[PDB]
Ligand binder design. Structure first.
Ligand SMILES: OC[C@H]1O[C@@H](O[C@@H]2[C@@H](CO)O[C@](O)(CO)[C@H]2O)[C@H](O)[C@@H](O)[C@H]1O
Length: 134
C-alpha cells in the first residue's frame, strides 16, 4: 500500500520467504501481507508498536474475498524500533510458520488453501532491504 509489492512469487509449500528490513526509530506499525492478491491474504502479519490502541503486539489475520477473518495475537514481540529485523515464512496445507528474531516461531492457520503464495505487499514503518526465496 506504501511499501514494496511483489507478484508472481509462486512460493510453493515448504519453500522459504525471507524478508529483512529496517524498523523505523519511531515505528508505530508495519504490515507484511501474503497471499494471492490484495483481497485474498493467507497471512496479514501486523506488528503493532503503537497503533489501534495496541502496544508491542503482533496481530495476525487472513482475508478471504475481501473479508477479514478472525484475528489472532501473539504474546511475544521480538521487534525493536530502530533496528533491523528478519522474518522468515513458510507454509503447508495446515499452517503458515513464521520465524522471527530472537528464535521466536509461531504458526497461523492456513485458512485459504492456496496452491502457492503469489503476492506479497509491505506497508508501514519497515523499510525492506532484502527479499529471498528457496
Ligand atoms: O484484523 C486485521 C485488521 O485489523 C484492523 O483493526 C481492528 C479494529 C478495526 O480498526 O478492530 C480490532 O480487531 C479491534 O482491536 C482491530 O484489530 C486494522 O484496521 C487492519 O489494518 C488490519 O490490521
Amino acid at each position: 500500500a506504501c511499501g514494496l509489492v511483489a507478484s508472481n512469487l509462486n512460493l510453493k509449500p515448504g519453500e522459504c520467504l525471507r524478508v529483512r528490513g529496517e524498523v523505523a526509530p519511531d515505528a508505530k506499525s508495519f504490515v507484511l501481507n501474503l497471499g494471492k492478491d490484495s483481497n485474498n491474504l493467507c497471512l496479514h502479519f501486523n506488528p503493532r508498536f503503537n497503533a489501534h490502541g495496541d502496544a508491542n503486539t503482533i496481530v495476525c489475520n487472513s482475508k478471504d474475498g475481501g473479508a477479514w477473518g478472525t484475528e489472532q495475537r501473539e504474546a511475544v514481540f521480538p521487534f525493536q524500533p530502530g533496528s533491523v529485523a528478519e522474518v522468515c515464512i513458510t507454509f503447508d496445507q495446515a499452517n503458515l510458520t513464521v520465524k522471527l528474531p530472537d528464535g521466536y516461531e509461531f504458526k497461523f492457520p492456513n485458512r485459504l488453501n492456496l496452491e502457492a503464495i503469489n503476492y506479497m505487499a509491505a506497508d508501514g514503518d519497515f523499510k525492506i532491504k532484502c527479499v529471498a526465496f528457496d
